[PDB]
């Protein structure tokens, strides 16, 4: 009887902090995003009613969590093996790929940026063997990447961390592009507790 009413507010509390996380993520305020992430992670264990609306946002939160820590190779979300958080965002984007029922036309353009980021970040951290592994296992070998696909290995062979290709890559615009992509496939409905807090403090 009371289990649903707990599940009801649990969805509410979960969807409120998912909104504040994107809003903090959009403003490049990853400290509060990381704090809010831990709150949502603590809600994962709680009874959340099986609603497809929250499963979609949890996967979006999964991807953005791995991107925010994508420059920190001293941690791994898929801990069973050792996968850089950007390799982690690749598999999550592939789980977002199937469950969100997307045509690959809209997805593959974003999967370019993540696989590109997964290799470049490994280059800037001087783990050159790691970069080429992601480079062969995930990079497309299609024409659009063929210019950059050939560009990266040459740098990894030369250990040329000063190549413009590596230093023109800005991680901030990479995250923000991944945000509006993942966010465009969710609806901007205002969370119920945010509306209900607006009425009280007025």
């Amino acid at each position: 009887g009371e289990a649903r009413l707990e599940e009801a507010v649990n969805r509410w509390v979960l969807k409120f902090y998912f909104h504040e996380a994107l809003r903090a993520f959009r403003g490049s305020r990853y400290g509060d995003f990381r704090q809010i992430r831990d709150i949502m992670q603590a809600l994962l264990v709680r009874p959340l009613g099986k609603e497809h609306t929250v499963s979609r946002l949890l996967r979006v939160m999964q991807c953005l969590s791995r991107i925010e820590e994508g420059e920190n190779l001293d941690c791994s979300f898929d801990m069973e093996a050792e996968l850089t958080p950007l390799e982690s965002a690749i598999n999550v984007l592939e789980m977002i790929k199937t469950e969100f029922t997307l045509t690959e036309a809209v997805v593959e353009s974003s999967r370019k940026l993540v696989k590109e980021a997964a290799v470049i970040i490994c280059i800037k951290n001087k783990e050159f063997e790691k970069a080429s592994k992601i480079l062969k296992k995930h990079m497309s070998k299609d024409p659009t990447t063929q210019k950059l696909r050939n560009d990266l290995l040459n740098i990894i062979r030369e250990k040329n961390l000063a190549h413009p290709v590596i230093q023109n890559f800005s991680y901030e615009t990479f995250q923000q592009k991944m945000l509006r992509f993942l966010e465009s496939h969710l609806d901007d409905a205002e969370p119920y507790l945010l509306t209900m807090a607006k009425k009280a403090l007025k």
Partner: peptide, 12 residues
């Protein structure tokens, strides 16, 4: 849903 939608990393 504890590692099903894992949001937090694990420091190596």
């Amino acid at each position: 849903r504890i590692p099903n939608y894992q949001l937090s990393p694990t420091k190596l």
